[PDB]
Amino acid sequence: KRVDFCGKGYHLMSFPQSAPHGVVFLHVTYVPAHEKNFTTAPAICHDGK
Amino acid sequence: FNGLTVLPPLLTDEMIAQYTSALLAGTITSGWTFG
Ligand SMILES: *[C@@H]1O[C@H](CO)[C@@H](O[C@@H]2O[C@H](CO)[C@@H](O)[C@H](O)[C@H]2NC(C)=O)[C@H](O)[C@H]1NC(C)=O
């Protein structure tokens, strides 16, 4: 859950692999895209509530 | 000076201030999604 600890962006999981004197991690990340603009409001008034 | 020298840093203070300002603007405006 700690941000950017492993993989740039939201993290899903990872795969390990060996190397002659080290390790290699493959991080799978989720990246949102195709953003659209909208207009919001914090609260809705109904029946005086 | 008798054989000792001082080298200048690669990044000047101005670009450091620019990075700090960019980070601050990004975190105020977009929250955390920009990270
Ligand atoms: C949200 O709506 C605004 C209003 O149209 C859009 O704002 C544009 O933003 C770009 C980049 O800053 C400017 O170059 C345009 O002039 C803006 N249009 C205006 C002020 O009419 C914006 O694209 C929409 N979407 C988002 C994600 O902000």
Side-chain angles (χ1 to χ4, degrees):
Chain A
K1 194 43 42 193
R2 42 197 287 173
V3 60
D4 220 325
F5 184 39
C6 54
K8 182 64 178 174
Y10 296 125
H11 168 259
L12 291 186
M13 61 80 71
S14 300
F15 296 117
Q17 300 285 260
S18 169
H21 276 328
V23 69
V24 166
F25 286 98
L26 318 181
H27 302 308
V28 169
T29 55
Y30 163 89
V31 192
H34 277 101
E35 69 279 20
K36 316 301 294 284
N37 191 343
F38 305 96
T39 293
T40 185
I44 298 289
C45 282
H46 185 69
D47 283 5
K49 304 186 294 293
Chain B
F1 288 170
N2 44 307
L4 61 83
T5 62
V6 172
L7 314 180
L10 166 67
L11 290 176
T12 195
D13 310 336
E14 300 300 315
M15 301 175 278
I16 290 169
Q18 210 158 343
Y19 283 165
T20 55
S21 166
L23 284 165
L24 191 139
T27 183
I28 295 170
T29 303
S30 61
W32 61 69
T33 63
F34 84 105

